[PDB]
Design brief:
Shape: globular
Radius of gyration: 17 Å
CATH topology: Hypothetical Protein Pfu-838710-001
Bound molecules: manganese (II) ion
Strand order of the largest sheet: 1-5-4-3-2-6-7-8
CATH architecture: Beta Barrel
CATH superfamily: Hypothetical Protein Pfu-838710-001
Structural class: alpha+beta
Number of strands: 9
Number of helices: 6
Length: 206
């Protein structure tokens, strides 16, 4: 895959998130409704090898829903900056849905990314895989001061979490730009130290 580098900051409260979305209103591009689902063996073979296999179902708020398969490998997350190798590929929506119900059916897709999972992690098929479940996220996308901001409201059983992300080749300068703005506007933030999947799997608020 290619390297995804992003600024990743946590917004500390629902009020902070609301204030930020209000402030960013003029810059709004689109709102995405995402359902993230994840797959691994019962022995956590992918996780143990620093890999996450996600099927994301998405819908923009013609607008057909989409399913994107992602393999993310060898992530780092430190000081508000994420770097991870990512491979993504669109698959048919109805096929993705079938796989959530019956993970073995991942074996029946002619997918580039799923072939890469088989080859790189030593599987001949997905008969041994389970669905770990998943969670919903609402992503607001803004075009602001030359960057694309993604503001996330992530819905877990144990509560919601809120983040601001920005994919960029200049993560230090962009992180500074964002932090200065949040500080001036008195919005509560910190570095994000956990991925959404890691929060999900922990079963508790970070
Ligand atoms: Mn992200």
């Amino acid at each position: 895959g290619a390297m995804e580098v992003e600024v990743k900051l946590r917004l500390l409260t629902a009020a902070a998130h609301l204030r930020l979305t209000t402030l960013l209103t003029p810059y709004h591009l689109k709102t995405l409704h995402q359902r993230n689902t994840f797959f691994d063996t019962p022995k956590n073979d992918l996780s143990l090898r620093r890999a996450v296999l996600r099927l994301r179902f998405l819908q923009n708020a013609p607008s057909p829903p989409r399913c994107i398969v992602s393999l993310k490998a060898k992530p780092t997350l430190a000081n508000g900056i994420s770097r991870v190798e990512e491979d993504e590929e669109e698959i048919e929506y109805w096929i993705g849905k079938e796989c959530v119900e019956s993970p073995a059916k991942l074996s029946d897709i002619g997918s580039r990314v799923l072939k890469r999972v088989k080859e790189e992690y030593g599987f001949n098929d997905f008969l041994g895989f389970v669905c770990l479940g998943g969670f919903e996220n609402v992503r607001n996308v803004y075009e602001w001061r030359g960057v694309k901001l993604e503001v996330d409201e992530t819905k877990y059983d144990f509560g919601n979490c809120y983040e601001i992300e920005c994919e960029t080749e200049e993560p230090e300068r962009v992180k500074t730009m964002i932090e200065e703005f949040l500080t001036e506007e008195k919005i509560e933030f910190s570095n994000s130290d956990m991925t959404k999947f890691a929060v999900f799997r922990s079963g508790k608020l970070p």
